[PDB]
Amino acid sequence: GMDKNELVQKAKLAEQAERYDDMAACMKSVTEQGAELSNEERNLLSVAYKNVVGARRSSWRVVSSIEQKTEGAEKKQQMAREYREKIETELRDICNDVLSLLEKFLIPNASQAESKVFYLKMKGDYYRYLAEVAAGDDKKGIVDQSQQAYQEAFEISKKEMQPTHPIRLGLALNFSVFYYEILNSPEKACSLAKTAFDEAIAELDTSYKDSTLIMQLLRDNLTLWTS
Amino acid sequence: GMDKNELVQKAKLAEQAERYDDMAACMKSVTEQGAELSNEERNLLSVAYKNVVGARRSSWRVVSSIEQKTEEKKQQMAREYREKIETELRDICNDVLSLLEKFLIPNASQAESKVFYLKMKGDYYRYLAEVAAGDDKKGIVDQSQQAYQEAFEISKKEMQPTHPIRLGLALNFSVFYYEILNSPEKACSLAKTAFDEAIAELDEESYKDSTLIMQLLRDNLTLWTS
Amino acid sequence: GXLDXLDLAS
Amino acid sequence: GXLDXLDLAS
């Protein structure tokens, strides 16, 4: 029993104190009240979750790897598996919250293209994270939902946003990394990223420090990936 | 229920994964089996709690000072959030202090260990002091002081002036005099005596660490003469 | 950043 | 590394 402003203010407090689970529980409730998030509220929800899920992925990547490199001890390699499993389920829960928030509230309520694209991209990111950690039975289907969502995002951004809008460019960045690291299609990763970099070069050839940072990241990927 | 070797192992995994609450839970149980902790286990317990106690203290410093800088229903909310953080913090210290009372201090069969765990009891009370209501403060503070004093007497009798545990104890204890007791005279002579006894002690291999504590001591001395 | 809400890959 | 454990009050 707390009101939307109060929730938003608590979220900012939690953000400051680096308490992101708190910050996420706050903005999850704001979202659950059913009204379309302003830019400010959407950004706070994104921040919270990016940090809440990112601590887990990072933890996962470490434990998983230790489990790869533990080849010998019959137990040393079971405890690491079990610990990976606990972390994975914490992670699957986090994505499943977010994905559900997206499906029930954020996408259906988005009145503007920029926010549609942002939420769709986020749905692509969060399925991507579930794909990372899926055992191959449900791993082709999660992978499809990721692509499906990034594709929808890409469609709208191509129609409604400037090639240099940072949300469109971040979408191209994430989706091209998806192609390369998840779907193993280096040529699809490459063409997406080159065409997004070139289109953004073309429209500027006619506030862009942020756009520009993303253009560099796409470029860096390109040169890494042709190598 | 997993055995000591298992919990230690989970604890090292958790440490790498940077999941310190997990890391703490493990070392809590290990300590609770009641055998004297090895060095490595003592270091694991300390790392785990230091991180689980630091994330809160840092949070409290931030929220506490947003509450101060302001004046509003915004101020009630900061305050309630401050109190919520404090209660998580008190919990962590009472767990730590209780592990020290029931296990670590009674079982420590080497001076070095005793001094270390006593110092630690002084630190954890210093932390409950930073955050006391105002009525139990004087009491909490006595406890911190008593534990640092006990640790101090053992470290004079039993360890070399340059031992990094003795020196770290001097450091923390002098910060307690400065920041918690409000006494800068006591803070200074403590920091100073410890720094000099260690210098005189150079006629002790091999701490690049023992020197680090020494620089921190002198830094404080320079910061406290103004 | 302005960019930390975009959850950028790499 | 080492001193990290000693919870130095800096």
UniProtKB/Swiss-Prot annotation, chain B:
Adapter protein implicated in the regulation of a large spectrum of both general and specialized signaling pathways. Binds to a large number of partners, usually by recognition of a phosphoserine or phosphothreonine motif. Binding generally results in the modulation of the activity of the binding partner. Promotes cytosolic retention and inactivation of TFEB transcription factor by binding to phosphorylated TFEB. Induces ARHGEF7 activity on RAC1 as well as lamellipodia and membrane ruffle formation. In neurons, regulates spine maturation through the modulation of ARHGEF7 activity. It comes from the Eukaryota. Keywords: Acetylation, Cytoplasm, Host-virus interaction, Phosphoprotein. The record marks 57, 126 as: Interaction with phosphoserine on interacting protein. Pfam families: 14-3-3 (PF00244). Changing residue 59 to A: Loss of sphingosine-activated PKA phosphorylation. Promotes homodimerization and heterodimerization with YWHAE. Enhanced transcriptional activity of P53. The modification Phosphoserine is found at residues 59, 183, 206. This is 14-3-3 protein zeta/delta. It is found in: Cytoplasm; Melanosome. Interacts with CDK16 and BSPRY. Interacts with WEE1 (C-terminal). Interacts with SAMSN1. Interacts with MLF1 (phosphorylated form); the interaction retains it in the cytoplasm. Interacts with Thr-phosphorylated ITGB2. Interacts with BCL2L11. Homodimer. Heterodimerizes with YWHAE. Homo- and heterodimerization is inhibited by phosphorylation on Ser-59. Interacts with FOXO4, NOXA1, SSH1 and ARHGEF2. Interacts with Pseudomonas aeruginosa exoS (unphosphorylated form). Interacts with BAX; the interaction occurs in the cytoplasm. (Microbial infection) Interacts with Epstein-Barr virus protein BPLF1 and TRIM25; leading to inhibition of the type-I IFN response. It comes from Homo sapiens (Human). The modification N-acetylmethionine is found at residue 2. The modification N6-acetyllysine is found at residues 4, 69. The delta, brain-specific form differs from the zeta form in being phosphorylated. Phosphorylation on Ser-183 by MAPK8; promotes dissociation of BAX and translocation of BAX to mitochondria. Phosphorylated on Ser-59 by PKA and protein kinase C delta type catalytic subunit in a sphingosine-dependent fashion. Phosphorylation on Ser-59 by PKA; disrupts homodimerization and heterodimerization with YHAE and TP53. GO terms for biological process: angiogenesis; cellular response to glucose starvation; ERK1 and ERK2 cascade; establishment of Golgi localization; Golgi reassembly; lung development; negative regulation of apoptotic process; negative regulation of innate immune response. Belongs to the 14-3-3 family. One of its GO terms (cellular component) is glutamatergic synapse. GO terms for molecular function: cadherin binding; DNA-binding transcription factor binding; identical protein binding; phosphoserine residue binding; protein domain specific binding; protein kinase binding; protein phosphatase binding; protein sequestering activity. The gene is YWHAZ. The keyword Membrane does not apply. Gene3D superfamilies: 14-3-3 domain. InterPro entries: 14-3-3, 14-3-3_CS, 14-3-3_dom_sf, 14-3-3_domain.
